[PDB]
Amino acid sequence: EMEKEFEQIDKSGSWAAIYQDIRHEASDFPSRVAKLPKNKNRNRYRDVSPFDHSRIKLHQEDNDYINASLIKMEEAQRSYILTQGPLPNTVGHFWEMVWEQKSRGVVMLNRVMEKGSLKCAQYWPQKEEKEMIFEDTNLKLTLISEDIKSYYTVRQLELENLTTQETREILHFHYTTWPDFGVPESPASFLNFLFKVRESGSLSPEHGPVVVHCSAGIGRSGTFCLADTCLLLMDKRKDPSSVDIKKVLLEMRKFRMGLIQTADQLRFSYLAVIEGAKFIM
Ligand SMILES: *[C@@H]1C(=O)Nc2ccc(F)cc21
Ligand SMILES: *[C@@H]1C(=O)Nc2ccc(F)cc21
């Protein structure tokens, strides 16, 4: 039971030590496409590079590269795309990826400005009547509606393929209250965030994978996928306490580097799963 393992690591203060065992056990795979010179500016500096084996390819004949990975959790029947916050020059690529993978949801875990720097381009429209056109990828994006809450905002967007005039509705889930430093004190509002994403149908097998991101460094994102997957596996296992967070993290770590970044994020992920369990079970 992870609750008892929690008190043990907490009372012993061994979070940095557990995390380092994870860092040392974690997969390392080639990322040759990410390091090509022609991809330097498609790549957010001081951000993780995608492994070649799990990387999302754009369907443009020119350059197929985006900093994005497919996490496939086989048991849980859950798949996620994890990506960097778009750059001014990759906003069109980001929406092409959303279009081509048939994603219903985009999950954003950062503010556009944190610590007085831009963590991410403004990649969606701020007003109904000012839509965005991405001329490089032949897409149009319109804000349909915006629902601002205390801890998060949900936006309905319409993405239009200007080439074929097909349109789809995309949900933008923006968690707005992650602090500039460290992790939330309680996981309550984050859990209410996940449940929201779940009830929308954005994580369901009838859609392409959800797109998750949160700037570059800090960590976040990892926490989102790790909590979702751990909770769903408790709905599946005859014994819910067979679920080992560390094992799940190491599986995801086969698909993308740079989850959980800090021991604090690891601690928060335990606390989110523990409190999510008690809420359901
Ligand atoms: C587990 C299961 O038994 N059926 C099902 C359907 C969708 C999922 F995402 C996960 C499961
Ligand atoms: C939840 C909410 O607060 N706003 C919104 C809009 C669309 C959805 F599918 C779900 C929600």
Side-chain angles (χ1 to χ4, degrees), residues 1 30 66 77 129 157 240 272:
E1 168 147 287
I66 183 176
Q77 310 187 24
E129 67 275 20
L157 308 174

Side-chain angles (χ1 to χ4, degrees), residues 120-178:
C120 174
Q122 181 61 53
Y123 64 85
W124 71 96
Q126 284 182 297
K127 298 166 173 249
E128 284 87 339
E129 67 275 20
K130 296 287 169 64
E131 68 279 8
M132 298 174 74
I133 308 270
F134 304 104
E135 286 192 296
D136 58 341
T137 52
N138 223 245
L139 286 167
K140 182 172 93 168
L141 183 70
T142 312
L143 177 68
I144 296 316
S145 87
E146 179 168 60
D147 224 59
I148 306 179
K149 273 137 187 56
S150 345
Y151 293 104
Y152 49 82
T153 300
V154 181
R155 310 184 178 85
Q156 294 177 238
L157 308 174
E158 178 200 270
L159 186 59
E160 182 179 336
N161 186 322
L162 286 182
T163 303
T164 65
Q165 300 197 263
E166 308 163 74
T167 66
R168 306 197 186 132
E169 176 179 84
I170 310 297
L171 301 173
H172 191 255
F173 297 93
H174 185 184
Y175 190 79
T176 52
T177 55
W178 195 294

Side-chain angles (χ1 to χ4, degrees), residues 75-78 203-205 232 236:
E75 195 180 355
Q77 310 187 24
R78 216 55 140 202
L203 296 172
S204 291
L232 175 55
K236 289 181 165 290

Side-chain angles (χ1 to χ4, degrees), residues 32 36 40 92 208:
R32 294 179 192 121
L36 294 181
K40 181 185 287 282

Side-chain angles (χ1 to χ4, degrees), residues 38-95:
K38 67 174 186 148
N39 285 332
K40 181 185 287 282
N41 71 344
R42 280 183 176 205
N43 290 317
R44 212 158 236 303
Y45 195 36
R46 318 172 110 263
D47 208 324
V48 125
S49 306
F51 298 139
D52 298 316
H53 81 78
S54 55
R55 79 181 181 91
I56 300 296
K57 303 191 168 128
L58 301 174
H59 312 161
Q60 76 187 204
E61 296 210 305
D62 175 8
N63 188 344
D64 70 3
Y65 179 75
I66 183 176
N67 193 329
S69 310
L70 184 63
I71 319 325
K72 275 176 305 204
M73 304 299 287
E74 195 167 288
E75 195 180 355
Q77 310 187 24
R78 216 55 140 202
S79 73
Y80 316 92
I81 297 171
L82 264 63
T83 192
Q84 70 182 16
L87 293 160
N89 57 305
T90 67
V91 295
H93 303 154
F94 175 89
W95 284 109

